[PDB]
Amino acid sequence: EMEKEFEQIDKSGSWAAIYQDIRHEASDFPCRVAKLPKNKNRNRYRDVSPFDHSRIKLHQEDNDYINASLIKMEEAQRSYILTQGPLPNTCGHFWEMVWEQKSRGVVMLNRVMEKGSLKCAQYWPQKEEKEMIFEDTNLKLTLISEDIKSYYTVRQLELENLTTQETREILHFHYTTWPDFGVPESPASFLNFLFKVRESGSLSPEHGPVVVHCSAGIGRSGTFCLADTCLLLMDKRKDPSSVDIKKVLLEMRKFRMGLIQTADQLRFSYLAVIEGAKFI
């Protein structure tokens, strides 16, 4: 399998070199819109920007900009929007994006605070009686229910477009145990969480693309989509062992820069795909 590749890279201690080679081969595309002066406060990180060709546009004549990219995986028949954790001023944009893109799910892979610092705004309501109104984009958001498990929490949220009074239910899948440092010791919980997201319909073609984020929207998010896509391809191809994780990662990198941020995240993605395949 890719399991023998894995075992070899481990014995050779060559994760850093494999990872660096991926970084060297990764696509480079312009991000002019992201870099415009008026958009400075719409970006959390100066070095994490969406490419112009794949960026999500807000349906808004003023400023259509949000730090989010559409990753479209043609063979696997899967699409994902990856975005940064909303900033104090981009929560209205974030939910405007969810509304216009017709997403069913949001996948959140970070805690609001990690390492003692804020990694994103508290962009969803924590009590059902205290809804949130986003005045800039005319959206109301209400917590409908919350189910806290040991490794993840799922919330049902109701998003209302106040201009048309249309209402949609959004599922919020919140993975809450990714460690502040490093990667999880075992991919078991992360895989379980991925299957819970799939089971909900959120990744399915009847809906717009799922929105996936952590603080920057490339590291954990890359892992989530990379694992999902490779597992799907292994189920659909005549030869499952032809699925090449490095090649899928580079294809994803054509749509958003920097997906998988460390060699340990790369190793972890391999482990997740390998154990997930053994389960399917």
Nearest to 120 by CA among 250, 50, 215: 215
Of 31, 91, 120, 214, the active-site residue reads 214
**81 is an annotated ligand-binding site residue:** no
- Indicate the domain borders of the chain: 1-280
Q: Quickly list DSSP for 207-218.
A: SBPEEEESSSSS
189 neighbors 174 (Cβ within 8 angstroms): no
User: What does the block give as tokens for 49?
Assistant: 């920007």
**215 is an annotated ligand-binding site residue:** yes
User: What does the block give as tokens for 243?
Assistant: 């699925």
Q: Where are the beta strands (DSSP E) in 39-198?
A: 55-57, 65-73, 78-83, 105-108, 113-114, 117-118, 132-134, 139-148, 152-161, 166-175
- Domain 1-280: CATH superfamily, name plus number: Protein tyrosine phosphatase superfamily (3.90.190.10)
148 neighbors 126 (Cβ within 8 angstroms): no
Strand-pairing partners, residue 69, are: 55, 82
Q: Give the per-residue SS3 of 81-112.
A: EEECCCCCCCHHHHHHHHHHHCECEEEECCCC
Q: Other CB atoms closer than 10 Å to residue 45's CB: what's the count?
A: 13
**180 is an annotated ligand-binding site residue:** yes
Tally DSSP H helices, then E strands, for the chain. 8, 11
- What residue type is 269 in one-letter code? S
Produce one character per residue of 145-182: b if its CB has 16 or more CB atoms within 10 Å, e if not: ebeeeeebebbebebbbeeeeeeeebbbbbbeebeeee
**261 is an annotated ligand-binding site residue:** yes
214 labelled catalytic: yes
**84 is an annotated ligand-binding site residue:** no
Q: Other CB atoms closer than 10 Å to residue 85's CB: what's the count?
A: 23
Cα gap 19→23, rounded to integer Å: 6
**120 is an annotated ligand-binding site residue:** no
Resolution (A): 2.2
205 neighbors 73 (Cβ within 8 angstroms): no
272 neighbors 188 (Cβ within 8 angstroms): no
Using only C-alpha atoms, the chain has a radius of gyration, in whole angstroms, of 18
HSE-CB of 94 using CA atoms within 13 angstroms: 30
Cα gap 139→92, rounded to integer Å: 7
Nearest to 63 by CA among 88, 30, 29, 97: 97
Q: What are the percentages of helix, strand and coil residues in the chain, rounded to 5?
A: 35, 25, 40
2 neighbors 237 (Cβ within 8 angstroms): no
Produce one character per residue of 55-82: b if its CB has 16 or more CB atoms within 10 Å, e if not: bbebeeeeeebbbbbbbbbeebebbbbb
**220 is an annotated ligand-binding site residue:** yes
